[PDB]
């Protein structure tokens, strides 16, 4: 999309991985405001957003909490306390067109400072002077939307840069967007420490013949002591044997 009609798309109820974006060696800028560039796979959010727009090279710096410019004020207003992360990369090879690329537009003239997270696709003739334009151009009245005109034979400052401003949000609803929880090999018949979903402790993992109902995860004994659990990956029932101890 363009800068004045940035189409966001919310994505929730998913296991999203951010390692394919940070450790990609393909993006130009990866300035993550608020949150750290790493350890983002351990922050479970409710719902995330993805703002998409194409700007020039010298306009990527304006996408930050607190800036001044024609794009950072009249086109896209980033909030002061931003917790997501801005992702941008060069796209001059496919976005630019030989002879002029007039498919990406932006708004120059407005009447007031824009608010954070606002999309105004209004196309009324803004009054530059004091006289009411009433909807005619040629009387010192200027059109708000202007063309970019991308050309491959330009400097680095006039090249298309697709920007994906990922936004985060932690609402009162239960968090759905979580992080990829990695797993390890199945260690059995040894005094080790298990790290299952709800259970955490130590013990000897052995084979079990108990057949659990196909909706449960673990099971406790008469004294509320867990002794048999089910593997998360495979539908197998294990027997947590207490690791041997004693006195000398």
């Amino acid at each position: 999309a363009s800068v004045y009609a940035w189409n966001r798309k919310r994505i929730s109820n998913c296991v999203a991985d951010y390692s394919v974006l940070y450790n990609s060696a393909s993006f130009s800028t990866f300035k993550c405001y608020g949150v750290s560039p790493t350890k983002l796979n351990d922050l479970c959010f409710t719902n995330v957003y993805a703002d998409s727009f194409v700007i020039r090279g010298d306009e990527v710096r304006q996408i930050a909490p607190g800036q001044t410019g024609k794009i950072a004020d009249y086109n896209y207003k980033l909030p002061d306390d931003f917790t997501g992360c801005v992702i941008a990369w060069n796209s001059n090879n496919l976005d630019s067109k030989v002879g002029g690329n007039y498919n990406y537009l932006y708004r120059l003239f407005r009447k007031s400072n824009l608010k954070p997270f606002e999309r105004d696709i209004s196309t009324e003739i803004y009054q530059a002077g004091s006289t009411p334009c009433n909807g005619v151009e040629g009387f010192n009245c200027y059109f708000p939307l202007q063309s970019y005109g991308f050309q491959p034979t330009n400097g680095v400052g006039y090249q298309p840069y697709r920007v994906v401003v990922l936004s985060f949000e932690l609402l009162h609803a239960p968090a759905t967007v979580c992080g990829p929880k990695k797993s390890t090999n199945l260690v059995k018949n040894k005094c080790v420490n298990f790290n299952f979903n709800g259970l955490t402790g130590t013990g000897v993992l052995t084979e079990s013949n108990k057949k659990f109902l196909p909706f449960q995860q673990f099971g406790r004994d008469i004294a509320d002591t867990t002794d048999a659990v089910r593997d998360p990956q495979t539908l197998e029932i294990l027997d947590i044997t207490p690791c041997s101890f004693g006195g000398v």
Partner: antibody, heavy 120, light 109 residues
């Protein structure tokens, strides 16, 4: 304003659609919009459509809606006016004109005129 | 804002005075939103006056627009032999742009 030129007289028969072209000299084409108006012998000028090149959107009147398909060509600065179902009452001189972007506009320049009378 | 019935029908009496070109309408016009034209011998027209008050680019001061309500008039002082065309009207104050009929100005015989 700009030196607007149109195509030649495309004399056809009732039951064959055509598309008239209109070049754009002088200044750029992604800055000023074009329109189309017909002029029939004895009748007056009736506005049909006005396409915005920068916004890639077009408009239609109340008596020509659905029966016309007006497009543009931003590669060579040319406007296309394709009219389907050319009836015998469509004998009119179609003029090309450039308008200003906005709700209201006026036809400052003019083209040449195309005769597409369906009597073949 | 929907019709532009021309009051005069023929001004071929004498090309040595002014004209009227009264473009009446049923609905009240907007704040002087009227455009005049000039078409000679069935060819490409030309823009004459915008806003009914200002002169167009390249048009000499031989014309004069008047009217601010609904009875707009166009007076052409010292009519020249060149002004032998049909003057139209365009009320661009409403949503649908409509035109009028015109008046054929010629000489007397």
């Amino acid at each position: 304003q700009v030196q607007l030129v149109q195509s030649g007289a495309e004399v056809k028969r009732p039951g064959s659609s055509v598309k008239v072209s209109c070049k754009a000299s002088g200044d750029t084409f992604i800055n000023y919009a074009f329109s189309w108006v017909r002029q029939a012998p004895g009748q007056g000028l009736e506005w049909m459509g006005r396409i915005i090149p920068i916004l890639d959107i077009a408009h239609y009147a109340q008596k020509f809606q659905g029966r016309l398909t007006i497009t543009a060509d931003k590669s060579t600065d040319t406007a296309y006016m394709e009219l389907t179902s050319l009836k015998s009452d469509d004998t009119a001189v179609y003029f090309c004109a450039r308008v200003f972007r906005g709700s209201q506009y006026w036809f400052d320049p003019w083209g040449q005129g195309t005769l597409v009378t369906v009597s073949s | 804002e929907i019709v532009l019935t021309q009051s005069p029908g023929t001004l071929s009496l004498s090309p040595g005075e002014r004209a009227t070109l009264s473009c009446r309408a049923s609905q009240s016009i907007n704040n002087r939103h009227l455009a005049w034209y000039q078409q000679k011998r069935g060819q490409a027209p030309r823009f004459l006056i915008y806003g009914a008050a200002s002169r167009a680019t390249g048009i000499p001061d031989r014309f004069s627009g008047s009217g601010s309500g609904t009875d707009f008039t166009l007076t052409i002082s010292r009519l020249e032999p060149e002004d032998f065309a049909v003057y139209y009207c365009q009320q661009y104050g409403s949503s649908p742009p409509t035109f009028g009929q015109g008046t054929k100005v010629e000489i007397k015989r």
